[PDB]
Amino acid sequence: KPKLHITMFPWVAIGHITPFIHLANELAKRGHSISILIPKKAHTQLGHNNLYPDLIKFHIVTVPHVEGLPAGAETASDIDITAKNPLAIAFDAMYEQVETLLYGLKPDIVFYDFADWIPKLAAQIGFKTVCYNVICASCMAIGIVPARHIPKDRPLTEEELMTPPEGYPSSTVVLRGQEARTLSFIGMDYGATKFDVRITAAMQGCDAIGIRTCRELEGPMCDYLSAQYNKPVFLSGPVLPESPKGPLEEKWEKWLNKFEPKSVVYCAFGSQMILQKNQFQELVLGFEMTGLPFFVALSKPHGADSIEEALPEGFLERVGDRGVVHGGWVQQTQILNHQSVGCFVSHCGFGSMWESLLSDSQIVLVPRLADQILNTRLLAEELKVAVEVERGDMGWFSKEDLCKAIKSVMDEESEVGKLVKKNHAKWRETLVSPGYMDNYLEDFIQQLYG
């Protein structure tokens, strides 16, 4: 069989383009040619990620003018909420450019996600398609499937959002009460149509549904998606990017060394979150309360001059040398791999979820977004490899509940800590089996050939 030529046309957001590039690297590593159609500014920011320049070629698409879209806006991170619909309209207006490029590129397969019209070009130009989703299957399965009726003329109610679609294969990976509002995006206006109409067309039009996940974590969700849309579901595995190389910052080495193995609690909420000052202070006071060593890597909260200017009064002494709160970039992988770290408090974002699973640290989860919550329910409630921090109806978590969650996995005399550590070790052993990640990628490629 000849190598494949795959064209990728992702939604214009760095958070979509970046995992498409990661997957492109994995495919070109196996000899396949990839053309990636993205806007100019995104290419300037991400072009260095191309590890196979002879095989992976970027093609710059211009963002058309639309009423409501500021000059120079190209991706979701360039706009505020008010330009949501204009940006989606401009994206859909890339049809003519993308048609032109596809006629020249003559790909075998086109990967897309929000470009629901790509299947129409598939029929005209002659290629196969994968609707490739860089998120977890549970969010796909609990939201926009034909079993869920979504009205055209009104928002869904909280009670409708709270109710999983008929046949949804889990009673544990579900939203709780007023968490339902985190799912409200499924019915939002999103350009000339509403989001669920676009997603339904994208999913029903593709030749196969592609998902950045694995059978071990989400098999039944994938089967449900396959049944709901009557489509094959191809799993690429999590396609995790290689971690930056080099020695851990010595100052962190000298610090972590001043502690017993598996004793330090590390915390980070990824590279997008910025907390409000009030929740930031409540968080750090929670870490202080545990009496355990901690290393918190968070962005300074909204409006702060610095991490130190936003800390609550008297914090830094009370704590002394027993905790670090740092607002600059840190080597999360090297920190998690340090023998002194024994717990990882995170928001259960996709990358942090996998890093937690693959580590030997206890897992404590403080989700915010819908996918984060569902990921948290899987780990904490279904697999029981983690604990979840209790929250209020508006997302707020107290220092007492954060402390209790950390204590519950640290305390050596805690049955819940013993259980999740035992379950985590089991699941970690699977997820590092011999050729676990590579086998998903090669299996994914063979599915593309069929």
Side-chain angles (χ1 to χ4, degrees):
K1 26 168 147 243
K3 296 299 183 177
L4 298 164
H5 181 197
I6 295 158
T7 297
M8 306 174 160
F9 180 55
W11 169 242
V12 287
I14 301 288
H16 289 235
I17 296 160
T18 299
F20 273 67
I21 291 170
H22 294 324
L23 178 60
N25 278 325
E26 291 301 336
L27 298 169
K29 176 175 163 182
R30 279 102 177 150
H32 306 285
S33 289
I34 322 293
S35 35
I36 305 178
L37 316 191
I38 55 169
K40 179 184 166 82
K41 282 198 299 185
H43 175 256
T44 305
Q45 292 311 311
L46 302 173
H48 66 279
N49 287 116
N50 185 347
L51 300 187
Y52 298 88
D54 286 325
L55 289 171
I56 299 171
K57 302 294 183 184
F58 289 100
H59 293 270
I60 308 310
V61 294
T62 61
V63 178
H65 297 161
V66 174
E67 190 56 53
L69 186 64
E74 297 182 349
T75 64
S77 56
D78 286 343
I79 60 162
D80 60 357
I81 210 81
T82 58
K84 173 191 66 164
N85 290 315
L87 184 63
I89 291 160
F91 173 77
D92 286 338
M94 295 163 168
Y95 181 97
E96 214 218 329
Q97 274 176 89
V98 172
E99 178 182 17
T100 297
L101 280 154
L102 288 170
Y103 264 122
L105 289 162
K106 285 171 191 171
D108 299 304
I109 308 176
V110 170
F111 284 31
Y112 68 99
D113 44 18
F114 290 1
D116 61 288
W117 36 270
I118 283 286
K120 295 188 192 181
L121 290 172
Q124 298 176 20
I125 294 166
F127 51 81
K128 299 287 179 193
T129 66
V130 174
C131 178
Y132 183 75
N133 297 266
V134 298
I135 62 169
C136 284
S138 59
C139 202
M140 305 171 48
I142 208 175
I144 304 164
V145 291
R148 178 189 291 281
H149 171 70
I150 306 181
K152 285 275 200 289
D153 52 354
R154 70 165 174 84
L156 289 151
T157 67
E158 284 73 26
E159 289 161 58
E160 282 168 324
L161 287 164
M162 155 142 42
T163 310
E166 166 77 29
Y168 178 77
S170 183
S171 63
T172 51
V173 184
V174 298
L175 303 176
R176 318 233 171 93
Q178 293 296 281
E179 294 173 349
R181 312 217 182 151
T182 65
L183 196 58
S184 64
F185 71 86
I186 61 173
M188 65 176 157
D189 281 26
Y190 208 74
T193 55
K194 60 205 305 279
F195 192 66
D196 61 286
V197 165
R198 170 194 301 276
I199 293 306
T200 297
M203 291 285 279
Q204 279 174 354
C206 65
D207 291 300
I209 297 159
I211 312 173
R212 186 185 190 201
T213 196
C214 61
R215 277 177 307 290
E216 283 77 14
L217 293 189
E218 302 202 281
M221 307 282 188
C222 298
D223 296 343
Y224 181 68
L225 286 158
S226 180
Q228 283 289 306
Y229 282 103
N230 189 28
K231 302 258 180 205
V233 170
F234 298 169
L235 300 188
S236 60
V239 193
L240 304 168
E242 258 215 332
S243 133
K245 327 195 142 49
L248 178 59
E249 157 71 66
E250 296 97 311
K251 294 166 186 67
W252 299 148
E253 192 77 25
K254 313 174 189 287
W255 191 78
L256 289 168
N257 277 344
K258 328 185 199 171
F259 297 114
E260 296 308 302
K262 294 315 196 40
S263 68
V264 177
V265 184
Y266 170 79
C267 174
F269 291 160
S271 0
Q272 247 41 83
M273 265 198 244
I274 299 166
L275 295 178
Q276 297 301 127
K277 187 167 167 154
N278 67 4
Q279 186 64 88
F280 167 83
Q281 295 199 339
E282 194 81 8
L283 177 143
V284 302
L285 289 170
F287 280 97
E288 173 187 21
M289 284 186 42
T290 65
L292 307 181
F294 56 95
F295 191 106
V296 175
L298 295 174
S299 151
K300 70 187 186 164
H302 288 109
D305 289 337
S306 67
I307 280 283
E308 316 80 62
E309 186 259 345
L311 289 172
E313 157 217 302
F315 189 78
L316 285 169
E317 308 79 74
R318 292 196 306 276
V319 167
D321 289 328
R322 173 177 94 247
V324 166
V325 190
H326 195 70
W329 179 88
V330 302
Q331 296 159 288
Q332 174 157 298
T333 299
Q334 279 93 336
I335 290 173
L336 271 181
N337 300 153
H338 193 288
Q339 48 180 51
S340 295
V341 174
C343 184
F344 182 16
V345 181
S346 84
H347 65 313
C348 212
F350 181 86
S352 293
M353 192 196 46
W354 274 96
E355 280 224 287
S356 300
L357 286 173
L358 294 172
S359 81
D360 77 351
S361 284
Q362 297 282 66
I363 307 170
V364 175
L365 302 172
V366 192
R368 166 193 38 151
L369 302 180
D371 60 302
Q372 294 160 13
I373 297 168
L374 297 164
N375 293 344
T376 293
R377 298 276 137 81
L378 170 64
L379 268 64
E381 199 68 47
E382 181 64 13
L383 312 188
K384 297 185 157 47
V385 297
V387 301
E388 173 185 5
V389 177
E390 292 125 338
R391 311 185 281 310
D393 277 350
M394 308 294 318
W396 173 261
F397 53 98
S398 69
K399 64 175 188 295
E400 288 77 26
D401 287 343
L402 170 64
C403 178
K404 183 182 73 143
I406 296 165
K407 280 321 227 71
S408 94
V409 297
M410 288 321 258
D411 288 348
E412 82 164 297
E413 217 58 346
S414 164
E415 295 167 281
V416 180
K418 297 169 175 300
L419 175 65
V420 297
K421 177 176 321 191
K422 168 199 235 273
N423 290 335
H424 184 188
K426 196 215 145 213
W427 277 95
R428 172 169 74 260
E429 154 211 86
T430 298
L431 300 172
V432 296
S433 52
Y436 182 82
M437 302 292 186
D438 284 354
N439 286 344
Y440 265 99
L441 293 170
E442 298 283 2
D443 277 11
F444 183 81
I445 288 165
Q446 296 306 314
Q447 282 169 312
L448 297 181
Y449 273 113

PDB file of all heavy atoms in Angstrom, residues 182 223 249 299 326 338 343 375 409 423 440:
ATOM      1  N   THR A 182     -22.441  23.925  32.658  1.00  0.00           N
ATOM      2  CA  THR A 182     -21.186  23.797  31.930  1.00  0.00           C
ATOM      3  C   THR A 182     -21.375  23.126  30.575  1.00  0.00           C
ATOM      4  O   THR A 182     -20.502  23.250  29.709  1.00  0.00           O
ATOM      5  CB  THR A 182     -20.155  23.018  32.754  1.00  0.00           C
ATOM      6  OG1 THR A 182     -20.596  21.665  32.935  1.00  0.00           O
ATOM      7  CG2 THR A 182     -19.973  23.667  34.122  1.00  0.00           C
ATOM      8  N   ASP A 223     -18.386   3.065  21.550  1.00  0.00           N
ATOM      9  CA  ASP A 223     -19.402   2.187  20.974  1.00  0.00           C
ATOM     10  C   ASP A 223     -20.744   2.898  20.863  1.00  0.00           C
ATOM     11  O   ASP A 223     -21.451   2.760  19.854  1.00  0.00           O
ATOM     12  CB  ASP A 223     -19.543   0.927  21.828  1.00  0.00           C
ATOM     13  CG  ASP A 223     -18.278   0.092  21.846  1.00  0.00           C
ATOM     14  OD1 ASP A 223     -17.409   0.298  20.971  1.00  0.00           O
ATOM     15  OD2 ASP A 223     -18.144  -0.755  22.755  1.00  0.00           O
ATOM     16  N   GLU A 249      15.218  22.486  36.764  1.00  0.00           N
ATOM     17  CA  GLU A 249      15.720  23.693  37.409  1.00  0.00           C
ATOM     18  C   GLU A 249      16.285  23.371  38.785  1.00  0.00           C
ATOM     19  O   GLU A 249      15.586  22.822  39.646  1.00  0.00           O
ATOM     20  CB  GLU A 249      14.591  24.720  37.519  1.00  0.00           C
ATOM     21  CG  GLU A 249      14.748  25.769  38.608  1.00  0.00           C
ATOM     22  CD  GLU A 249      15.845  26.772  38.308  1.00  0.00           C
ATOM     23  OE1 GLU A 249      15.694  27.543  37.338  1.00  0.00           O
ATOM     24  OE2 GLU A 249      16.839  26.812  39.061  1.00  0.00           O
ATOM     25  N   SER A 299      -0.837  30.614  37.540  1.00  0.00           N
ATOM     26  CA  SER A 299      -0.741  31.996  37.106  1.00  0.00           C
ATOM     27  C   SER A 299      -1.227  32.914  38.217  1.00  0.00           C
ATOM     28  O   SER A 299      -2.166  32.580  38.947  1.00  0.00           O
ATOM     29  CB  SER A 299      -1.561  32.218  35.836  1.00  0.00           C
ATOM     30  OG  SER A 299      -2.027  33.552  35.768  1.00  0.00           O
ATOM     31  N   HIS A 326       4.459  29.581  42.847  1.00  0.00           N
ATOM     32  CA  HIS A 326       5.256  30.156  41.770  1.00  0.00           C
ATOM     33  C   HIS A 326       4.375  30.472  40.570  1.00  0.00           C
ATOM     34  O   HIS A 326       3.637  29.604  40.095  1.00  0.00           O
ATOM     35  CB  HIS A 326       6.378  29.201  41.354  1.00  0.00           C
ATOM     36  CG  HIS A 326       7.436  29.846  40.515  1.00  0.00           C
ATOM     37  ND1 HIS A 326       8.319  30.777  41.017  1.00  0.00           N
ATOM     38  CD2 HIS A 326       7.746  29.702  39.204  1.00  0.00           C
ATOM     39  CE1 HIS A 326       9.133  31.173  40.054  1.00  0.00           C
ATOM     40  NE2 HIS A 326       8.805  30.538  38.943  1.00  0.00           N
ATOM     41  N   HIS A 338       9.921  13.810  39.927  1.00  0.00           N
ATOM     42  CA  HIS A 338      10.824  13.870  41.069  1.00  0.00           C
ATOM     43  C   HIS A 338      10.318  12.965  42.187  1.00  0.00           C
ATOM     44  O   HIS A 338       9.116  12.909  42.463  1.00  0.00           O
ATOM     45  CB  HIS A 338      10.977  15.310  41.563  1.00  0.00           C
ATOM     46  CG  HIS A 338      12.110  15.499  42.525  1.00  0.00           C
ATOM     47  ND1 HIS A 338      12.076  15.038  43.822  1.00  0.00           N
ATOM     48  CD2 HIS A 338      13.334  16.055  42.355  1.00  0.00           C
ATOM     49  CE1 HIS A 338      13.215  15.335  44.423  1.00  0.00           C
ATOM     50  NE2 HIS A 338      13.999  15.946  43.553  1.00  0.00           N
ATOM     51  N   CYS A 343       1.718  13.625  45.206  1.00  0.00           N
ATOM     52  CA  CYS A 343       0.333  13.965  44.916  1.00  0.00           C
ATOM     53  C   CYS A 343       0.309  15.057  43.858  1.00  0.00           C
ATOM     54  O   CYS A 343       1.178  15.933  43.841  1.00  0.00           O
ATOM     55  CB  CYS A 343      -0.394  14.418  46.190  1.00  0.00           C
ATOM     56  SG  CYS A 343      -2.162  14.752  45.995  1.00  0.00           S
ATOM     57  N   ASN A 375     -14.281  13.905  32.859  1.00  0.00           N
ATOM     58  CA  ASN A 375     -13.011  13.227  33.112  1.00  0.00           C
ATOM     59  C   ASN A 375     -12.841  12.938  34.598  1.00  0.00           C
ATOM     60  O   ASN A 375     -12.386  11.856  34.986  1.00  0.00           O
ATOM     61  CB  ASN A 375     -11.836  14.079  32.612  1.00  0.00           C
ATOM     62  CG  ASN A 375     -11.804  14.233  31.098  1.00  0.00           C
ATOM     63  OD1 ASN A 375     -12.460  13.493  30.367  1.00  0.00           O
ATOM     64  ND2 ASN A 375     -11.029  15.209  30.623  1.00  0.00           N
ATOM     65  N   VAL A 409      -5.989  11.399  50.528  1.00  0.00           N
ATOM     66  CA  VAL A 409      -5.098  10.561  49.730  1.00  0.00           C
ATOM     67  C   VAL A 409      -3.681  10.484  50.293  1.00  0.00           C
ATOM     68  O   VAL A 409      -2.909   9.616  49.856  1.00  0.00           O
ATOM     69  CB  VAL A 409      -5.050  11.015  48.252  1.00  0.00           C
ATOM     70  CG1 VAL A 409      -6.417  10.866  47.616  1.00  0.00           C
ATOM     71  CG2 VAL A 409      -4.533  12.439  48.126  1.00  0.00           C
ATOM     72  N   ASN A 423      -5.921   1.154  42.938  1.00  0.00           N
ATOM     73  CA  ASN A 423      -6.541   1.201  41.616  1.00  0.00           C
ATOM     74  C   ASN A 423      -5.669   1.949  40.614  1.00  0.00           C
ATOM     75  O   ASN A 423      -5.555   1.536  39.455  1.00  0.00           O
ATOM     76  CB  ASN A 423      -7.932   1.832  41.701  1.00  0.00           C
ATOM     77  CG  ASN A 423      -8.928   0.940  42.411  1.00  0.00           C
ATOM     78  OD1 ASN A 423      -8.764  -0.279  42.442  1.00  0.00           O
ATOM     79  ND2 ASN A 423      -9.965   1.538  42.987  1.00  0.00           N
ATOM     80  N   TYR A 440      -1.833   2.064  19.411  1.00  0.00           N
ATOM     81  CA  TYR A 440      -3.021   2.820  19.015  1.00  0.00           C
ATOM     82  C   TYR A 440      -2.778   3.564  17.708  1.00  0.00           C
ATOM     83  O   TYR A 440      -3.650   3.603  16.831  1.00  0.00           O
ATOM     84  CB  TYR A 440      -3.435   3.791  20.120  1.00  0.00           C
ATOM     85  CG  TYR A 440      -4.490   3.222  21.036  1.00  0.00           C
ATOM     86  CD1 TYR A 440      -4.147   2.681  22.265  1.00  0.00           C
ATOM     87  CD2 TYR A 440      -5.830   3.216  20.665  1.00  0.00           C
ATOM     88  CE1 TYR A 440      -5.109   2.154  23.109  1.00  0.00           C
ATOM     89  CE2 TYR A 440      -6.800   2.692  21.501  1.00  0.00           C
ATOM     90  CZ  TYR A 440      -6.432   2.163  22.721  1.00  0.00           C
ATOM     91  OH  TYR A 440      -7.390   1.636  23.558  1.00  0.00           O
TER      92      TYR A 440
END
